[PDB]
Amino acid sequence: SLIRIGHGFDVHAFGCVTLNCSDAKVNINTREEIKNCSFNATTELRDKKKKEYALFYRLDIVPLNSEYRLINCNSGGDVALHALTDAILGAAALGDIGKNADSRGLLREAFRQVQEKGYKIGNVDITIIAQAPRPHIDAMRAKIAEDLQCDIEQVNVKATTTEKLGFTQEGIACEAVALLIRQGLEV
Amino acid sequence: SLIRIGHGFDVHAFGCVTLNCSDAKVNINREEIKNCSFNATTELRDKKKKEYALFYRLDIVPLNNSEYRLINCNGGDVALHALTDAILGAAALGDIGNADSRGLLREAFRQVQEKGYKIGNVDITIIAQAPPHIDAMRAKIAEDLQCDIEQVNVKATTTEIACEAVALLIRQGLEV
């Protein structure tokens, strides 16, 4: 029997925020533009925001009647699936390919490709590293095992909190590891 | 037999400090927050700087009106926490289950054992900005996992505290 491991990592962040911008001054110096936008960033308290600036590409933002928004947008499950996706594909040597397809879609497409390569899932284990606050991990497990065509006992999901260590912010991350196995029993 | 892979991760503070915490506001609209001060470290020898930071009341313990400290004031507590989270996650259990990490490591191993699993191998890599032992530690967790030291690995990769851990479980058995 053949058996393979994978590893995924992903951070998706920057909630939908209206972008209040102005063109930049940077040839290469192929030259792309690219702008310097301003937005209400998020903090660790719900009811408090902060003004920030960052450089954004004009082909990755859509003007909304000088106002813009970044394509794609929020979102804690979306990172876990992208990480699990990279892990499934990683264990079967397929890399990563894709705008923002349904993250639940991409996870099922990765499974269908490893499935034709002669592998099923053995077990899966996912770790959520975030700053918040077991709310819905059992809702995730179900939705994950359904897309991998296994049982919840073959899917584990967790959350580590980076707050016992101080903090003063943005972002949510996720690491995942997968075990693939050949399907085929000798009965 | 049946094989399972697991992964865990934990992060703790490098050393113990005292916090000078003033009552802030969560903006009501239990969850409490504090805005605290402490002597932060710098690169120079014996030169601290003052810094503020925010802390959830759940992780600090007072000293007794406006002074607290961190609960995990201890250096393997960060490693063992990530290893329990790794073997637990392999057997699909949770995160996690107060103190005595090594007891939590023994408890995590009996809960996978009732599910009929034993350790096949573990690999633990600690990550520190400032780079010891570890042979002492990998001999201790081979006692709590009830396995050979040859299947327990610890290493420390540094930047020219955090810890990752992966575990592999082999079903109880097996027949010749």
Partner: antibody, heavy 133, light 109 residues
């Protein structure tokens, strides 16, 4: 040395035009809101106009709405007041003053770095505008 | 829209005495949307109170602001020689924002 400096005052005739400039220094200009205030020597103060950090919120007093026009240019740390159809009532000392560096909306949430024009901590010296024939 | 009316128009105090200035609003104003200022002849105003009752940086706790709805009040618990000046109220609960005509605290003799 954090300062505000008004300029462009002077004499001007009834029904005429004049434009005041306030040049900031020593603080992040785009984080704060600005106001113009006028005061005739001896009597009390009167609010004229107000402006938030980027200009998206600009309001005027009853006595100047439709005659004054507040603008700013965060690239050069400067704010303007363009006045048309000046009467003699409009004679006074024209202060330029710094607003807040924060704001709060009707739902009570705090936005740092997006100053509005509620209360004023830093005042300019004041430029005099005399409207007379 | 909202006009502010201060009282008394003049407050003749001897040094070390308590001062209390009233400022009555034509309409209700949120208690945390109010501000007071000080001004001496030939100088620009100086922010004293904002957000109804919060003291500004560099303002001793002799000064204290307060009030809700229609009555706002500024109290100087012990007038210092440097405190004889003009005091304005100001509301920012609704635009257009406005000041009172000012209260003048003179030296009594």
């Amino acid at each position: 040395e954090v300062q505000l400096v008004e300029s462009g005052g002077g004499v001007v005739r009834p029904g005429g035009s004049l434009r005041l400039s306030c040049a900031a220094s020593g603080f992040i200009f785009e984080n704060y809101g600005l106001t113009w205030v006028r005061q005739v020597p001896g009597k009390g103060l009167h609010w004229v106009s107000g402006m938030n950090w980027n200009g998206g919120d600009t309001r005027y007093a009853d006595s100047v709405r439709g005659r004054f026009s507040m603008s700013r240019d965060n690239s050069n740390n400067i704010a303007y007041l363009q006045m048309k159809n000046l009467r003699v009532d409009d004679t006074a000392l024209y202060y330029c003053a710094r607003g807040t560096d924060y704001t709060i909306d009707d739902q009570g949430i705090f936005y740092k770095g997006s100053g509005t024009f509620w209360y004023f901590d830093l005042w300019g010296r004041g430029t005099l505008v005399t409207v007379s024939s | 829209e909202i006009v502010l009316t201060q009282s008394p128009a003049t407050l003749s105090l001897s040094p070390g005495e308590r001062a209390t200035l009233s400022c009555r609003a034509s309409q209700s104003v949120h208690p945390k949307y109010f501000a007071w200022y000080q001004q001496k002849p030939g100088q620009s105003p100086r922010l004293l109170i904002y957000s109804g009752s919060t003291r500004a940086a560099g303002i001793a706790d002799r000064f204290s602001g307060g009030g809700s709805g229609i009555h706002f009040t500024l109290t100087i618990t012990r007038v210092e020689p440097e405190d004889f000046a003009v005091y304005f109220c100001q509301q920012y609960g609704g635009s257009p924002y406005t000041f009172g005509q000012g209260t003048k605290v003179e030296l009594r003799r």
